[PDB]
Amino acid sequence: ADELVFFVNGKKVVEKNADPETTLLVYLRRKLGLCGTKLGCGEGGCGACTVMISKYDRLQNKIVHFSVNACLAPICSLHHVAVTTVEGIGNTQKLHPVQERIARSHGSQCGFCTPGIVMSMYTLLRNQPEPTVEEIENAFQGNLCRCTGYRPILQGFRTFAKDGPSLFNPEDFKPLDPTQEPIFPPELLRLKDTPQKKLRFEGERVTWIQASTMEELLDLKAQHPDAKLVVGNTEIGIEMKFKNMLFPLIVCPAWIPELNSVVHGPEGISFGASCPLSLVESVLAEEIAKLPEQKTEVFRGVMEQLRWFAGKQVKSVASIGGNIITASPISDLNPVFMASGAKLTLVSRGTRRTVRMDHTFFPGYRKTLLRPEEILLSIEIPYSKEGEFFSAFKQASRREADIAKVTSGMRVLFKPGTIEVQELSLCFGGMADRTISALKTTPKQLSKSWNEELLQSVCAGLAEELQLAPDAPGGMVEFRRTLTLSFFFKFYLTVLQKLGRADLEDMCGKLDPTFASATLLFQKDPPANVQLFQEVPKDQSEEDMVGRPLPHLAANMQASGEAVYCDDIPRYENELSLRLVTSTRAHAKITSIDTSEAKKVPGFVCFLTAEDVPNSNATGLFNDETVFAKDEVTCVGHIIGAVVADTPEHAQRAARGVKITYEDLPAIITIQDAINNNSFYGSEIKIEKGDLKKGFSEADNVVSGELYIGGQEHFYLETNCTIAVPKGEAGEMELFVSTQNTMKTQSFVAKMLGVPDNRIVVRVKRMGGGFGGKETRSTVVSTALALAAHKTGRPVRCMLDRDEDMLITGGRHPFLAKYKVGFMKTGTVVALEVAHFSNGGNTEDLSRSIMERALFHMDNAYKIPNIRGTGRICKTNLPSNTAFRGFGGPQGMLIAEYWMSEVAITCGLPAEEVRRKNMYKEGDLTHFNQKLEGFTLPRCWDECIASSQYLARKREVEKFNRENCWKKRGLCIIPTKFGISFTLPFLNQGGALVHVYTDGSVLLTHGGTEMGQGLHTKMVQVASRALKIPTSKIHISETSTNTVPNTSPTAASASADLNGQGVYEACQTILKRLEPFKKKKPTGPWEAWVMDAYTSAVSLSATGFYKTPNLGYSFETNSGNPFHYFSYGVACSEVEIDCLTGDHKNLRTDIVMDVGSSLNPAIDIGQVEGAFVQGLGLFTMEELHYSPEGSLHTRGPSTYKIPAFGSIPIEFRVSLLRDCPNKRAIYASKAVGEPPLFLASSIFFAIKDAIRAARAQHKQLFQLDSPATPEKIRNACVDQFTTLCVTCKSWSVRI
Ligand SMILES: Cc1cc2nc3c(=O)[nH]c(=O)nc-3n(C[C@H](O)[C@H](O)[C@H](O)COP(=O)(O)OP(=O)(O)OC[C@H]3O[C@@H](n4cnc5c(N)ncnc54)[C@H](O)[C@@H]3O)c2cc1C
């Protein structure tokens, strides 16, 4: 047959013409209109596309449920399954407990990840209605969230756990009733009786065969060796989508019973090749639990690899054979299967052979010794024998859901009753183009005794055998080499212990108890979290929600997937799709463009270039950017043109048929390239105070050095998206955009078209994250699309894929700092000179303002009487860098804390003492001459140091450190000051419009956009207090250029301060109009006043506006206030590093934050944790790599590792400072968005201390660049392993 039949949320689907290249995500969203399930990445990393599958399993004879990534599930694999999406478990009329709890617990901010997390938690509960805390965290390994910091999500779902004033009340949560879950489609139960027959699906390019029997599979492969096997599609899905490979014949064997069997034999367990590795997990788990330790050494090796193997979504469908035959050089399983010589059985039509995975199974890049007509039937995973021990290792950039840098299986077999080596196997991933054995090192150790000589021998061997070319793909050559020695050392120590417990301690020797911690398998304690905030007064009306923890107004709809993001908006019947075509060279003239292949693609409409621009090709904030490339491209990812087509699939294919010819031009990539070439955005910026010559002469000590700070991708989970709708009259156009900047979107589209602004309407409902990345760079999509719509007279839409978004839109500015600080022996700093260099990319954008903010913050919290800061903004052939939460502040303040760390240690005084005595006091002037009034930072400091019990913890850390050789702890307390207001004064303005309808209901709008920070929630809270009506009677629908004009972007943490005042004033005007009707009827209700004013013909509409008074700094005169006030905060953080791998635990973080009198402590704490965890990523995890030719390598969650559920401080405590009203801002609040982010430097400097301790154990003022990744941490822990590894064309360059 050829009809595809499955169910979605209980509703039957018959697809008569199923295309093999159609993903379930595309089918749900575009074909069925169910847009709760989101696209976040397309590569199986983010889990925003998570849905549940149910089916009758023919083999275990029961209904089963598991989770999948819809983005990677082919609909042609889903015959006779039942899909459940977020829409199928509940809605706002009747939320499922999962939805209720994530929403009420403040677990949904921007809302974009909330459906996929719901669906992960939902699936766990359908499998296990009483899970453990462990099982709950484990459920979300495949789910990323960029806003919340994860804490509230876990805290809310802890209420489900078997073994489980305040922000929420878990006792109002309605109970789970599993009888109320949706029926498994009866029809699917009826069909379980019928045998499965072979299916054939035919699309544009691809034919899919679903083989029902092994005979059919082997026949097909005999007659057509070229048929591509697809099982989980977790590899092929990626090959097709990201490496533009096309397999025109696919066969899916997933149904075949022989490929799904589990047979327990004498030598081990044999898994069918199509067994999902989730089934491998459950089988080996049960086996490990019931069998003796002695014979489950290999099994435990596999389970250890599978712990750190993606998450539940991938492992549900990913097959064991899948991973083997893919032959990735970084398989986590193949090293283990090889090290254990696992038995693989192969078959074709009328042949069958068995072999042991050794080095010959993997001959070359991505090849196996399988013949083209042959398929893998099964892998036996062996029982271990007496005197046989195994370890598995993996080090990445992040523990969870990451791809190996180095990964290994290691096996030793001892001659019986001995410590003499019979067999040894050391196999590695990530060290060559294939899984390799250390064949030249292993044989030398035969019959040797397991001792310090074998340990040194093997290490010398691995050092010589596992060479890396400096060009070697992936880089990190020293770290990768070190890792192989380090893993073997752990194996060595582990074997000693295992010998020990076999009663041969007398022969091999005891383990020094300070080495024991080396061999321990990763374990985390259960989390503990604390949230402290201030109750509102006794007096305050229960209808006055200002200061109360009101949940985000859209939380319920976000958990239900009813909240509408831009691409969720239904398509017009005549709507077209746009796809950007981008430069693949950093600097080069465009010689020619050939659209000849692009036109052959069915659906192609046109290719837009500079020539099609009606009016101006000059755009960007400083008018120095092209809408489309004209003559030369100036970065890899420079936008050249845009394809327009009927569908996105057709737009993408057509876009591949635009062939461009280039002629290269001198490229300027790095900060150094830029310095050498004097290529800069404008002149040097400078702040200078006191006498620098004097200060340095007086200083007992002077320290000099450099610090590099890597950039950051925003990874808003909703990428950039615009729909442009042309109106056909007078140049009128309406845009629906995920942007923080409606005004610039409007202006840029207007100018590009050559029509006045009054013709262009930009509408923003909400964004799934912004973080500064949608302050300006959203417009490169908006303009291309506006043009397509103008040209065609048709609606046009573009949502960027994650790879596109990451390449085109740029990030946080990398900084290079050169510093010279002079101080006394007491720790007091008397002179500071710091040169700052940013890499700004190929347009000015916000770069100059960012450098200004960095300089405004080079003091951090410290009075420095003699100080000189300069910044220079490099102009390079890279994507233009832009605003990222902090806007140069974090960069500024890290440099300050870096040299401050070096002062502390040069003086041999405690860090905290040196910091405290250097701290400004109330009434002081900054280096830019602004008075610090209401300086709460000391209170923040004294509270945090006391509540975190900093001094006692110091002692515990010191103790751990001298009792452990290969693990070390560090502890650091970091303050911050953050200035509040746009560096550009006139941007400190906002507007509101309010209407009161005759039913008494209020429709409010202001210039701010909602991106998950809870701005609308806050403004509703404000309006409610202002008008003295319940929040229930006030609504905000959207943000729009034709309701409030000339709005500043939603940025600089300012948007609640500005819009809050606007809203307030709009409400004051209304109240003034209602006054006389209130006097006549003081008790009669709101509705009566309103209807009275209407029937007396009094206006019930009003604008409101606010400007921040008394702002304006001058760099000429070093006078005037840049800031309206300052945010202040302090964080104490503890880490434990692994000295042999570079991995670390974030053990505990304590934050005290001054948000004034919080408008909303639930949102404010959320913003603290969110900001903090972004900082955490910036300073420890998140790293962007570029080729020396300036091509971003790092384009997806696979290779760009943001903080995961497992990344957050195990113990995470946030307190909002009590009794600190900030009268100048709306209802005595303070901004909160950005200031907390820098406090994650506490973890950077805590890692610093741990490294220092590791160095003393095995050069002072050692270098630690940001981000402090595994690579840097491990490389800085110099030891006998690094020293034997350490000593051109290369994969990447430091930009
Ligand atoms: C988000 C994400 C995270 C990942 N993390 C990891 C990780 O941590 N470690 C890791 O090692 N891998 C990882 N992978 C890779 C992938 O998940 C595994 O390699 C997986 O086992 C592939 O199995 P599959 O069934 O999806 O293979 P498919 O993609 O269906 O097929 C893969 C290849 O195997 C072939 N094939 C499948 N079965 C057979 C058979 N019986 N005989 C012959 N050929 C066959 C196919 O033709 C194809 O060439 C990750 C992938 C994703 C998307």
Ligand SMILES: O=c1[nH]c(=O)c2[nH]c(=O)[nH]c2[nH]1
């Ligand atoms: O002073 C600022 N100006 C901005 O334009 C901006 N954008 C941002 O994210 N933070 C800041 N800060």
Ligand code: FES
């Ligand atoms: S969209 Fe499917 S995993 Fe990210």
Ligand code: FES
């Ligand atoms: S709230 Fe999770 S990505 Fe925004």
